[PDB]
Amino acid sequence: SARKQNNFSLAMKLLKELHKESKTRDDWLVSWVQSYCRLSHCRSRSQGCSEQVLTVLKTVSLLDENNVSSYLSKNILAFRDQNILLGTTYRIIANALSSEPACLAEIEEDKARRILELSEKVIAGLYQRAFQHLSEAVQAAAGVIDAYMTLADFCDQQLRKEEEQAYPALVVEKMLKALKLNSNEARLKFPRLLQIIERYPEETLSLMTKEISSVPCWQFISWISHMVALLDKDQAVAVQHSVEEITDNYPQAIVYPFIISSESYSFKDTSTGHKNKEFVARIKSKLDQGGVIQDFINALDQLSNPELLFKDWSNDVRAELAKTPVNKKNIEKMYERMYAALGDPKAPGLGAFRRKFIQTFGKEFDKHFGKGGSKLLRMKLSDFNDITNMLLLKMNKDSKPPGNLKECSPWMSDFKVEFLRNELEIPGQYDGRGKPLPEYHVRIAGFDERVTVMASLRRPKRIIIRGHDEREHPFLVKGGEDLRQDQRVEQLFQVMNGILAQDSACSQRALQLRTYSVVPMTSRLGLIEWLENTVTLKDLLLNTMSQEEKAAYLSDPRAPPCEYKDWLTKMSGKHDVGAYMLMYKGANRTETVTSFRKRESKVPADLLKRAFVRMSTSPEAFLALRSHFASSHALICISHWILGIGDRHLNNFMVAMETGGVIGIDFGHAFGSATQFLPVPELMPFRLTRQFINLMLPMKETGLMYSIMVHALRAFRSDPGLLTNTMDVFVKEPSFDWKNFEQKMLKKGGSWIQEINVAEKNWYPRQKICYAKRKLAGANPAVITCDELLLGHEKAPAFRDYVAVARGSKDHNIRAQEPESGLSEETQVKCLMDQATDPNILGRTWEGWEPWM
């Protein structure tokens, strides 16, 4: 327990006094020495390179002492554990030696000759010794999976070194055998096998096809979206039986991934290309056999507004016809896909699903298609696509609020619970991690009549659909948005808080990210759970202000917004977006900080404190509200900095007014992209402004937001691997690229209007992982931000000014006083906080980010 809780030197103090009473009787000295080895490894984990060896040669001197002539001689359990321990010690020494330039030979010659038993030659010998010891261990529930996983990750990290042998033949089988019983760590490490297969198509293919059949089926649902997209391309024979039997056993965790993968499909003209076509046809035929999932998706499609759908269509055509002058036989097929459920006034029939508004849309916009069908369908010339925006204006002028009745979708409204029909099985379940029980999963037995529309620049609708469990499950249907990235970041947060719940430092504080289920049934149509009793942070700040204060904030051009705009346009001379380009060089640190402080001194300081004290009615529960708010916000801030998540404006943050916890949404920039592909880069690692500092104003910010961030960062960086492997899987996913990045950017407006072609090479889906590993293994956040600016804002005339303002001044801004790498957790988080609260950075950020509040 002491070793588990990181409370070191207490296990040492007790083991020193327990050493004598361990060799008098057998079957105890082996356990004593193995615990000593585990303690030494754990202590060496959190130490420097020079001291890492000095604390592991001592144990190996003691571990080799008290030799095999004991209970260890033959019970093939102590032997296996000891082999694992020797392998771990040797690999630790090898990693410590190799990480440095091998200039660690400043220790006394005694240790030099002690480690010289078996330059690069000794390193290779140590690696070989570790490999042999691990092989000996694996040659022999719990206690056996450990050796399998140890050898597997050893081989994986050895192979990863070559990216910048017989290991692939080993690791695949050695980890599939472990996963066969139960292994969540290998479950999260599964797509590394896919990367191995892509790297070594000539080996282990038949090995997997023979081995993957033995594994239980339900351990694959958590990664089914990778396999379904995999079988589209080559190497589909690697795993095809598992998909077939999983769509046989559980034909509900496959339908949506299959639909999204089959929306964009590919094949080959060879025998292999001709192969798997019958397979995918058979899978699609055995699925949707009742034709009810497609009916549900079509019914939900009518719920989405048509105005923003046509806006997305206009963006798509104005991008394709412009950037692809030689595009052929694409505009007509997209024209019919758009006609499928939106175009014709005579939709009744195949179109169907009367809405009284889409049919009203089939009453004014209908047959306004001369321009359209009569010309672009025949000559197919681009002509001018900007002569269609007044059409959108015309349909927007009649943007009546729908949803007064559910009769806007007849299938939705009269969805009686019909008898045996291959029932719907409401999306969101099938999370993996255990035996699924589809008989216990809830199913929808009726949709609520009342439907309300939110306000998020897309106007998503809220449905209050019921369930067969006699419960009411609210949901928020999102139309026209690809939710695959949201699913990926939610899985990332799941593994993140799983890591967070595996250390006494963070588990004692009950540190846990709050996640909401996200499930996209198809492209441009997904469901995100609508959490109950939550208030957006911006609304919580606004509504708690006095009426006069709110009026003076939204008007009276002395308020921070208009004053900031006037300051920018006066310092730069431009009244348009992008004036920051010349505004950055237009001021020094002193003028910027003085102006920022003057502008920030307008909004009330204790607005958050007033909001928290206005819904407590007790000095005894207000403290327990503020504490929870601060703790959760700090945790999500450090977690967001671990990834590249940016664009943390007020509307994204939601605070659960019931209990004070904070949640984040709208992960539109999964990895570092808020500081690269924008007119104005976001230089703050996270959000920490005056309303967060003054929430505990009589008590400096280094009190509660500091220890929480330190503990979370230590928990993340002390156990790399699972998190790093998951991020590497996500970045290399082929649905995450600049084919949908620009799509979701044009889904919004104003920020990063997409007109570029050379930058498509500037995506670099290989440096994101390098930067994440650097900032996770210890790196100055200023250095990381400067590197991101260098990558994304190359040959920019203001790039030098950007790096200068993101670096520091050596008189303040502690974030530039430390080595560029090898930082400790406390110093790293201090640099994070200083960058977040630097007035210079906040004073020259995007206006919409609202830096003042």
JSON list of N, CA and C in Angstrom, two decimals, residues 62 229 279 335 368 561 693 729 788 846:
[
{"chain": "A", "resi": 62, "resn": "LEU", "atom": "N", "xyz": [21.60, -6.61, -4.44]},
{"chain": "A", "resi": 62, "resn": "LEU", "atom": "CA", "xyz": [20.89, -7.39, -3.43]},
{"chain": "A", "resi": 62, "resn": "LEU", "atom": "C", "xyz": [20.01, -8.46, -4.06]},
{"chain": "A", "resi": 229, "resn": "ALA", "atom": "N", "xyz": [-13.86, 0.99, -40.75]},
{"chain": "A", "resi": 229, "resn": "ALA", "atom": "CA", "xyz": [-13.13, 1.78, -41.73]},
{"chain": "A", "resi": 229, "resn": "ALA", "atom": "C", "xyz": [-11.94, 1.03, -42.32]},
{"chain": "A", "resi": 279, "resn": "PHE", "atom": "N", "xyz": [-18.68, -9.69, -49.10]},
{"chain": "A", "resi": 279, "resn": "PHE", "atom": "CA", "xyz": [-18.73, -9.64, -47.64]},
{"chain": "A", "resi": 279, "resn": "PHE", "atom": "C", "xyz": [-19.49, -8.41, -47.15]},
{"chain": "A", "resi": 335, "resn": "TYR", "atom": "N", "xyz": [-25.85, 16.91, -56.06]},
{"chain": "A", "resi": 335, "resn": "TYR", "atom": "CA", "xyz": [-27.11, 17.59, -56.29]},
{"chain": "A", "resi": 335, "resn": "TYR", "atom": "C", "xyz": [-28.29, 16.67, -56.00]},
{"chain": "A", "resi": 368, "resn": "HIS", "atom": "N", "xyz": [-38.36, 27.02, -57.40]},
{"chain": "A", "resi": 368, "resn": "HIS", "atom": "CA", "xyz": [-37.38, 28.07, -57.64]},
{"chain": "A", "resi": 368, "resn": "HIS", "atom": "C", "xyz": [-36.06, 27.36, -57.94]},
{"chain": "A", "resi": 561, "resn": "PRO", "atom": "N", "xyz": [-15.69, 45.45, -24.14]},
{"chain": "A", "resi": 561, "resn": "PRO", "atom": "CA", "xyz": [-15.71, 45.04, -25.56]},
{"chain": "A", "resi": 561, "resn": "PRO", "atom": "C", "xyz": [-15.45, 46.18, -26.53]},
{"chain": "A", "resi": 693, "resn": "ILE", "atom": "N", "xyz": [-9.56, 34.18, -10.74]},
{"chain": "A", "resi": 693, "resn": "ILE", "atom": "CA", "xyz": [-8.60, 34.50, -9.69]},
{"chain": "A", "resi": 693, "resn": "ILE", "atom": "C", "xyz": [-9.31, 35.10, -8.48]},
{"chain": "A", "resi": 729, "resn": "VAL", "atom": "N", "xyz": [-3.22, 6.88, -31.87]},
{"chain": "A", "resi": 729, "resn": "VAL", "atom": "CA", "xyz": [-4.26, 6.25, -32.67]},
{"chain": "A", "resi": 729, "resn": "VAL", "atom": "C", "xyz": [-5.21, 7.29, -33.24]},
{"chain": "A", "resi": 788, "resn": "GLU", "atom": "N", "xyz": [4.69, 25.52, -32.07]},
{"chain": "A", "resi": 788, "resn": "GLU", "atom": "CA", "xyz": [3.44, 25.48, -32.82]},
{"chain": "A", "resi": 788, "resn": "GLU", "atom": "C", "xyz": [3.31, 26.69, -33.73]},
{"chain": "A", "resi": 846, "resn": "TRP", "atom": "N", "xyz": [-7.96, 37.20, -29.25]},
{"chain": "A", "resi": 846, "resn": "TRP", "atom": "CA", "xyz": [-9.16, 37.38, -30.05]},
{"chain": "A", "resi": 846, "resn": "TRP", "atom": "C", "xyz": [-10.26, 38.04, -29.24]}
]
